[PDB]
Design a protein around this ligand. Structure first.
Ligand SMILES: Cn1nnc2ccc(NC(=O)c3nccn3Cc3ccccc3)cc21
Length: 127
């Protein structure tokens, strides 16, 4: 059970736009989550080989992490803020699916998710 390649982060064949909502997701949301005390395990794809989790990618077919989301924002991969919000939600849900409730990694994800939801509530309206 080798690791898969990381998610795609740059596609020159997709149309691009710079918007106040996408800028907020990078400059505020990704920034504030990245610096959270529990952010480290979520800053790069799950290395299931190094962590000796041979079933991780048998269970999780839509992996996602904040390093990927940072790159997607930087490369104008998303047309809409909702596409980026979905990637964050996928990251949290993957953790909740793979692990037992109350596991340390789940409590950490839950704390990151709480901060995420607060920042998404303050998502500015489209300019
Ligand atoms: C199993 N699991 N389920 N979702 C997960 C999402 C991310 C990680 N990351 C890590 O374990 C990790 N990243 C960098 C270092 N570590 C070691 C470590 C082991 C245990 C707890 C914290 C950190 C595991 C996940």
């Amino acid at each position: 059970s080798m690791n898969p390649p990381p998610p795609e982060t740059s596609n020159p064949n997709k149309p691009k736009r710079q918007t106040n909502q996408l800028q907020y997701l990078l400059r505020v949301v990704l920034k504030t989550l990245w610096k959270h005390q529990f952010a480290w395990p979520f800053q790069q794809p799950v290395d299931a080989v190094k962590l000796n989790l041979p079933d991780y990618y048998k269970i999780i077919k839509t992996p996602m992490d904040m390093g990927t989301i940072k790159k997607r924002l930087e490369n104008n991969y998303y047309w809409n803020a909702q596409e980026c919000i979905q990637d964050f939600n996928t990251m949290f849900t993957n953790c909740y699916i793979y692990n037992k409730p109350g596991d340390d990694i789940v409590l950490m994800a839950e704390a990151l998710e709480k901060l995420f939801l607060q920042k998404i509530n303050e998502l500015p309206t489209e300019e």
